[PDB]
Design a binder for this molecule. Structure first.
Ligand code: COA
Ligand code: HC5
Length: 599
């Protein structure tokens, strides 16, 4: 970002070896057997002995930190995304459900879309001018690098690994966005010759031309190709761009500031599954027969505007994290609520260029294969959207407890109630207080949380006694959270030690081939909090076949929840997990209310 600000930021540290290993052993106690823990304990001692393997790997990481801006940056981006070969849809690209808008006709839909585009361009002005306000977390300045990765960027299919292109700072920065309607892409300039951005009224006029130039959905949904396996898409992509026209259209899409998807009307569904269907529409598009072909999942930022008033977005994870994305959302949404002023008669405008695609028998086959693949993915995705209206951050705070920790502890309780045991739990932690920092792992399953979930369901433990255990678990989780954001967690560290071993060309350390580590890294619960002023909520698929994907936005009086699971695993059920979570939160409130502290 603004290089001045970035330079004053501390560099991602490398936690002490013995410290991280100690935290690791503690986080394992609640998720592994005594026999397994005892063995790991032995591997740890040997691993960190003087003159041992761990010490050499640690030294390597410290050297890496001295010759790079962030010793973790490239490794993370690579292992977490660029090398992740599964489809980006559902398994990687997070989806976001925004507050439903009130437009009831085409003009209204296009009206909001125009306002949204203008709001994004407004936010972009701060990025180009580097005037974007500095943010804080834990009272520390935060990295703003992510904001210069979301716009005018795109992921690119690679035979072995993927790459990312960013034109935000190219010789002549893109001044156009891409609009998709009925699977057809259009190149739309949102800036005038002089350099000033088009007005909402002006953008609206352009969207109309675009909409009328693609009234029928007869064209092939070429964009659905971006939802297939990366290896398959890499090859299909290479073929697709062999045509001059096709390559030209793709280039326009990749360079576009961002994409706006004008989704078509979808079959009315039951009211008890409506929100789940809107979440699916934002995450994957619903299917090849709906709006899945009306997208380009390699594009970093995709804003979706439904015909029935619904709206949201889906973004490619290799670019940024949640906070930056939601920050842009809060600004855009708040912008669409701003009144109108200058309604002067706008001057004529050019016809948005239509990014055509020359289909061939081979390309057609690729599209069909993509449809088939996407159909399987969607059929296996189990989503449950839960709006916890009972309460929000308000109650936990009135109890002098961290809301997020309260929620995480509630999730642990809910899981234990269902399966009778704890499980490796992952909660995203922001490392933005460090230059180029992304995230680390907060492990919600601990000695204190397990002690709580056990005593909580113990009909032989005094209700007041469960209160102490509850507060202790919450405090323990808050402590872990504070350490994580300060670069004191151990997950990314341990990952670094393993990649370092690989780089040092030494045999894989036993500690990394240990069963305990496999268990610890197999997150049956993958979660993250998406704080936002806008009453929205994010969602993503589970990270493992037998796990859940839980995302939430804690508001003051309520909490927006999203729970995902796979139908391939009979042991998991999104609705059930959501219900136990809701009940878990309530029971914890009841417990605390039944035993006030003040007198
Ligand atoms: C882990 C994380 C979410 C915790 O955030 P947090 O703001 O500390 O969450 P908390 O629940 O502790 O605090 C929320 C509110 O409760 C309050 N609070 C916390 N502890 C409290 C206490 N003991 N008593 C009273 N109030 C308390 C906070 O002041 C805050 O108040 P606000 O509503 O006025 O802002 C954050 O540190 C982080 O890392 N976020 C990034 C996650 C991410 O990257 N997500 C996207 C992944 S792609
Ligand atoms: C709208 C975005 C909601 C959060 C998505 C998220 O948490 O992505 C995580 C990023 C990280 O922790 O590195 C990964 N995860 C989805 C697997 C938790």
């Amino acid at each position: 970002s603004h290089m001045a600000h970035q330079d004053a930021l501390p560099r991602l540290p490398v936690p002490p070896l013995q410290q991280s290993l100690d935290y690791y052993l503690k986080a394992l106690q609640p998720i592994v057997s005594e026999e397994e823990w005892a063995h790991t304990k032995q591997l740890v001692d040997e691993f960190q002995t003087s003159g041992g393997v761990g010490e050499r790997l640690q030294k390597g990481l410290e050297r890496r930190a001295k010759k790079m801006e962030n010793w973790l940056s490239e490794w993370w981006l690579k292992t977490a995304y660029l090398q992740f070969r599964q489809p980006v849809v559902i398994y990687s690209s997070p989806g976001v459900i925004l507050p439903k808008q009130d437009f009831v006709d085409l003009q209204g839909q296009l009206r909001f879309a125009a306002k949204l585009i203008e709001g994004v361009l407004d936010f972009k002005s701060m990025i180009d001018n580097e005037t974007l306000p500095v943010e804080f977390l834990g009272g520390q300045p935060l990295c703003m690098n992510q904001y210069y990765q979301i716009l005018s960027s795109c992921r690119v299919p690679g035979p072995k690994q993927d790459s990312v292109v960013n034109f935000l700072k190219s010789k002549r920065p893109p001044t156009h966005i891409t609009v998709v309607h009925n699977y057809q892409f259009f190149e739309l300039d949102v800036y005038h010759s002089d350099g000033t951005p088009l007005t909402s009224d002006q953008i609206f006029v352009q969207l109309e031309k675009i909409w009328n130039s693609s009234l029928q959905s007869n064209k092939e949904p070429v964009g659905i190709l971006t939802s297939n396996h990366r290896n398959t898409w890499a090859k299909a992509y290479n073929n697709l761009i062999k045509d001059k026209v096709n390559r030209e259209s793709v280039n326009s899409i990749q360079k576009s500031i961002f994409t706006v998807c004008l989704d078509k009307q979808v079959p009315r569904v039951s009211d008890d599954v409506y929100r789940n269907h809107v979440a699916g529409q934002m995450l994957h598009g619903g299917g090849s027969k709906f709006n899945s072909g009306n997208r380009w999942f390699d594009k970093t930022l995709q804003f979706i505007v439904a015909e029935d008033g619904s709206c949201g977005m889906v973004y490619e994870h290799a670019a940024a994290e949640g906070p930056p994305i939601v920050a842009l959302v809060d600004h855009v949404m708040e912008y669409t609520k701003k009144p109108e002023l200058v309604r002067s008669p706008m001057v004529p405008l050019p016809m948005p260029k239509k990014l055509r695609f020359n289909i061939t028998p081979e390309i057609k086959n690729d599209i069909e294969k993509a449809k088939q693949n996407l159909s399987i993915m969607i059929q296996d995705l189990d989503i449950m959207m839960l709006t916890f209206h009972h309460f929000g951050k308000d109650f936990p705070k009135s109890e002098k407890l961290s809301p997020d920790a309260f929620i995480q502890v509630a999730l642990q309780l809910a899981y234990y109630r269902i399966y009778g045991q704890a499980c490796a739990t992952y909660e995203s932690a922001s490392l933005r207080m460090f230059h180029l920092g992304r995230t680390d792992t907060i492990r919600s399953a601990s000695i204190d949380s397990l002690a709580f979930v056990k005593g909580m369901g113990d009909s032989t433990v005094p209700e007041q006694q469960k209160v102490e255990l509850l507060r202790k678990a919450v405090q323990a989780h808050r402590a872990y959270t504070d350490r994580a954001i300060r670069g004191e967690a151990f997950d990314r560290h341990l990952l670094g030690l393993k990649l370092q071993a690989i780089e040092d060309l030494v045999s894989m350390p036993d500690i990394f081939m240990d069963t305990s580590y496999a268990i610890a890294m197999h997150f049956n619960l993958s979660t993250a909090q998406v704080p936002a002023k806008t009453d929205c909520v994010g969602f993503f698929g589970p990270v493992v076949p037998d796990g859940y994907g839980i995302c939430y936005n804690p508001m003051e009086a309520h909490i927006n929840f999203s729970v995902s699971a796979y139908n391939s695993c009979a042991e998991t059920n999104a609705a059930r997990m959501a219900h136990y979570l809701e009940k878990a939160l309530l029971d914890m409130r009841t417990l605390l209310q039944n035993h006030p502290r003040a007198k």
